[PDB]
């Protein structure tokens, strides 16, 4: 699919059997989701953004099904205004910017 | 130009006669740059990102030359770890996401 940017590039994803909308964020190095349970041992980490830094939990090799594709990679969990699909998963689907 | 996401999608831009690198950010609704002066009257505003909110100065109708293209739109000035090209200017260059 080709996605314009006139509106927020939100996509429906399936992660750990839960349905969520996430933002295709080329400005996000990593993927972060709002609170939820995930499989595996997680290490507490901290991420930094525009308005400050955020303490969160890091999970490795998490399966997300995004708009019909599948990817496995690091997913961070913590308070975010949006679920964000960072570049760690965008590359796996071969996502690119064009103009 | 086609841009993959294995590396940060930074581009060289020319704004107010100054050369800067900025992040092509599909997750950013608006464009924000680190401190600098700009033409016109600015209204103080506050933006909200991951980890908190940030007070900034809003400027309207600002010309940025991005990788050979020209755009005019709202640019916000404030303390950000990166200069970010939000969707308010990405649409003007016809930027899209593809996969
Ligand atoms: C939090 C999102 C819903 C929106 N953000 C855009 C996003 O691309 C930022 C843009 C960004 C880029 C670098 C630094 C701060 C913010 N990237 C980001 O938060 O990524 C974080 C998760 O992965 C890591 O990658 C770096 C930061 C971490 S935002 O920076 O806060 C933002 C919000 C509104 C406007 N008008 C402009 C920018």
CATH of the domain at B37: 2.40.70.10
CA atoms within 13 A on the CB side of A75: 23
Cβ atoms within 10 A of the Cβ of B84, count? Answer: 22
Round to whole Å and give the CA distance between B54 and B74.
Answer: 17
Where in the sequence is the domain holding B23, given as residue range(s)? 1-99
The number of folded domains in chain A is 1
Provide the resolution (angstroms): 2.2
Q: Are strands B31-33 and B69-77 parallel, antiparallel or unpaired?
A: parallel
Cβ atoms within 10 A of the Cβ of B82, count? Answer: 17
Q: Rounded to whole angstroms, what are the CA distances from A41 to A44, A58, A59, A89, B61?
A: 10, 9, 7, 20, 49
Place of tokens 């900025």: B22
CA–centroid distance, B16 to ligand 1, in Å, is: 24
Round to whole Å and give the CA distance between A43 and A8.
Answer: 31
Contacts of B3 in chain A (CB under 8 A): 96-98
Binary contact (B82, A53; C-beta < 8 A):
no
Round to whole Å and give the CA distance between B28 and A41.
Answer: 31
Round to whole Å and give the CA distance between B97 and A80.
Answer: 22
Backbone angles phi, psi at A36, to 5 degrees: 180, 160
Within the 19-58 window of chain A, which residues sit less than 8 Å (CB to CB) from chain B? 23-29, 32, 47-54
CA–centroid distance, B57 to ligand 1, in Å, is: 18
Q: Which residues contact B9 (CB under 8 A, 6 or more apart)?
A: A26, A97, B3, B23, B24
Contacts of B93 in chain A (CB under 8 A): 99
A24 in ligand 1 pocket by Cβ < 6 Å? no
| Residue closest to A15 by CA, chosen among A96, A54, A58, A69 | A69
């Amino acid at each position: 699919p080709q996605i314009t940017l006139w509106k927020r590039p939100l996509v429906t994803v399936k992660i750990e059997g839960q349905l969520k909308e996430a933002l295709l964020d080329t400005g996000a190095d990593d993927t972060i989701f709002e609170e939820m349970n995930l499989p595996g041992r997680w290490k507490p980490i901290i991420i930094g953004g525009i308005g400050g830094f955020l303490k969160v939990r890091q999970y490795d090799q998490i399966l997300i099904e995004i708009c019909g594709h599948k990817v496995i990679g690091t997913v961070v969990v913590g308070p975010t205004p949006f679920n964000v699909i960072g570049r760690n998963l965008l590359t796996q689907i071969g996502c690119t910017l064009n103009f």
